[PDB]
């Protein structure tokens, strides 16, 4: 069976996004054809005559549901079955319908949520809707759980008389509107004494499974309308089946033939490639407090550490930086020496001009070098501002991985927008494990559409969005192309140390035209297209090559003396040996090193005793 289409949902509570039609276009552009909102559902500032019929598809919301400040007459949320309530509005509410009138005290009228049957966690708040019809009759006992029946705030005041009665066919007049299709379907309070949860009837043969959230169409666990905690292949589980089962007979643990990894609210066959795999059989985002993320054995793992594990910082939006929205000038200290951000990174224009609202001073551009030790982000990277004097993302030169576990808007994992930089300069970036890439709006940066991003993309379905940066020929005319010392693979900047691969060879972190063979100041050799210096004790060969390796063992001829296989500067004269006996040697004719006479303690300048006048 096919997945349900998901949408991210908004998180801007009462904020208006432009005019009344700029706002409605964003609401429409987001929740069109959606069927499962992963975040919140916020319907605000919708004016009359607007057609909200694209909301007829949403079936469950994982956050809250806020309906405020509207003036439209009817909001057709008539397929919503569940509000999971994983996030509250005003700390207590998983459904708030507030102040839906215009100046004339005539606003929202028809909210026919005729399929809304359960609100997992949270209360409900209704207030100040002077034209709302047929909702004060609802019995909210069947919907919201009994733990929260005390935190509810229902204020109903129409008392104008623009409503019609409820079709006399449902218990106690409880109706969601007018019609034989539009009244409350009770599934919890009409249960028999033995039904553990929801029940599709009053007879004791109608109890649903203990994991059906809204209701059911059968007694089993594959007959739920919507699962309550976890979701197996087609059944509703309480917990994902463990990978290993205990054997009460042999007092050991046996492999489970259908053990699944718990990932999010589903049981999968195997964790996603970029997620950490614990031993409980669960895909997580960060190893435990006493564990550090162990290397890839094909997959990520958590290994226990001895004493201090390491220095790893929490990114923005997690841990102590839960409500900070940028890299303040006050929190920047806490990223002092950590080489792996365990979260996100936002750099917004607020950091650089300060924020008086949260009492934050302006950030100092020279302090951004604190991030030069970072080598791995496990979330995303969002750079919206950079100091204008700088012409490169200098703080992120040592960055190598972006894991992309949490993405921006749920899609992007690297975003560089509206900056003054001339080149990106992430010269050591190697991989982007998940999420898209947007680099657009930078009026000068053009060293950006040369990289082969498909090399960095760890998975499939990743794309790059690089538009309206600079010219693509206006900096190829002024010469802002890469150095001819770079492979056609790509280039991060104008230097030769800013290429993906080299044309000929390389001197460490920089590309060159040829190794220093034959001539040059330091003698070198070639292996894997790298230039390594010969041991200082290798004689500068003006004819052929000089050496065939790093060690003095590969020299063509030595510079001073020769102690056997090795090329030494001066023959040993005090080196520890066997039986605690010292070692003294001498240089003969061919500058060869030979051992002294055992007796010669103060060393010797010749063979045997005649050689050392002691």
């Amino acid at each position: 069976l096919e997945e349900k289409k998901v949408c991210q949902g908004t998180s801007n509570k009462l904020t208006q996004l432009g005019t009344f039609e700029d706002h409605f276009l964003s609401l429409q552009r987001m929740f069109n054809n959606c069927e499962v909102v992963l975040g919140n559902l916020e319907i605000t500032y919708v004016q009359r005559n607007y057609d909200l019929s694209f909301l007829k598809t949403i079936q469950e919301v994982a956050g809250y549901v806020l309906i405020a400040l509207n003036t439209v007459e009817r909001i057709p949320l008539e397929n919503l079955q569940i509000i999971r309530g994983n996030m509250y509005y005003e700390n207590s509410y998983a459904l708030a319908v507030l102040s839906n009138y215009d100046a004339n005290k005539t606003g929202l009228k028809e909210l026919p949520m005729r399929n809304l049957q359960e609100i997992l966690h949270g209360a409900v708040r209704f207030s100040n809707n002077p034209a709302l019809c047929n909702v004060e009759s609802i019995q909210w006992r069947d919907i919201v759980s009994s733990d929260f029946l005390s935190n509810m705030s229902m204020d109903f005041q129409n008392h104008l008389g623009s409503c019609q009665k409820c079709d006399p066919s449902c218990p106690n007049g409880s109706c969601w509107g007018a019609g034989e299709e539009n009244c409350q379907k009770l599934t919890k309070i009409i249960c028999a004494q033995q039904c553990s949860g929801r029940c599709r009837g009053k007879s004791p043969s109608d109890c649903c499974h203990n994991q059906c959230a809204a209701g059911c169409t059968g007694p089993r666990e594959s007959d739920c309308l919507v699962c309550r905690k976890f979701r197996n292949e087609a059944t509703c589980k309480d917990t994902c089946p463990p990978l290993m089962l205990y054997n009460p007979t042999t007092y050991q643990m046996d492999v489970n033939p259908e053990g699944k990894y718990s990932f999010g609210a589903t049981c999968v066959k195997k964790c996603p490639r970029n997620y950490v795999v614990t031993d409980h059989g669960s895909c997580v985002r960060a190893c435990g407090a006493d564990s550090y993320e162990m290397e890839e054995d094909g997959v990520r793992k958590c290994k226990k550490c001895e004493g201090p594990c390491r220095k790893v910082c929490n990114g923005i939006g997690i841990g102590e930086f839960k409500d900070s929205l940028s890299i303040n000038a006050t929190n920047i200290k806490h990223f002092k020496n950590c080489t792996s951000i365990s979260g996100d990174l936002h750099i917004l224009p607020v950091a650089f001009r300060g924020d008086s609202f949260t009492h934050t001073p302006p950030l100092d551009p020279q302090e951004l070098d604190i991030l030069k030790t970072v080598k791995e982000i496990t979330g995303f990277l969002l750079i919206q501002a950079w100091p204008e004097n700088r012409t490169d993302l200098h703080a992120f030169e040592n960055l190598e991985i972006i894991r992309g576990r949490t993405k921006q808007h749920g899609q992007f994992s690297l975003a560089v927008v509206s900056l003054n930089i001339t080149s990106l300069g992430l010269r050591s970036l190697k991989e982007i494990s998940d999420g898209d890439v947007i680099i657009s709006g930078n009026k000068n940066l053009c060293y950006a559409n040369t990289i082969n991003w498909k090399k960095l993309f760890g998975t499939s379905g990743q794309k790059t969005k690089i538009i309206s940066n600079r010219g693509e020929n206006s900096c190829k005319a002024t010469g802002q192309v890469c150095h001819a010392l770079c492979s056609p693979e790509g280039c991060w900047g104008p230097e030769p140390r800013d290429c993906v691969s080299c044309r000929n060879v390389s001197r460490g972190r920089e590309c060159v035209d040829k190794c220093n063979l034959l001539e040059g100041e330091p003698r070198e050799f070639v292996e894997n297209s790298e230039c390594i210096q010969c041991h200082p004790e290798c004689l500068p060969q003006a004819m052929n090559i000089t050496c065939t390796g790093r060690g003095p063992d590969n020299c063509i001829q030595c510079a001073h003396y020769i102690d056997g296989p090795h090329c030494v500067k001066t023959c040993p004269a005090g080196v520890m040996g066997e039986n605690n006996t010292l070692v003294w040697k001498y240089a003969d004719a061919g500058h060869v090193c030979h051992l002294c006479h055992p007796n010669c303690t103060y060393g010797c300048t010749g063979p045997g005793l005649e050689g050392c006048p002691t």
Binding site: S11, T15, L17, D22, V350, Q411
Partner: protein, 47 residues
Amino acid sequence: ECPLSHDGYCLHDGVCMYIEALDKYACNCVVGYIGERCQYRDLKWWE
């Protein structure tokens, strides 16, 4: 509209509003910026 402590509340040149119905403060974001304080660019649509 909104008092002295809420100057510089809306980022990216948004304008702060007072909602006398609810007694709250909200931002009227410019086109292209999202979030509660207009802090985020809308990367999913038009740069």
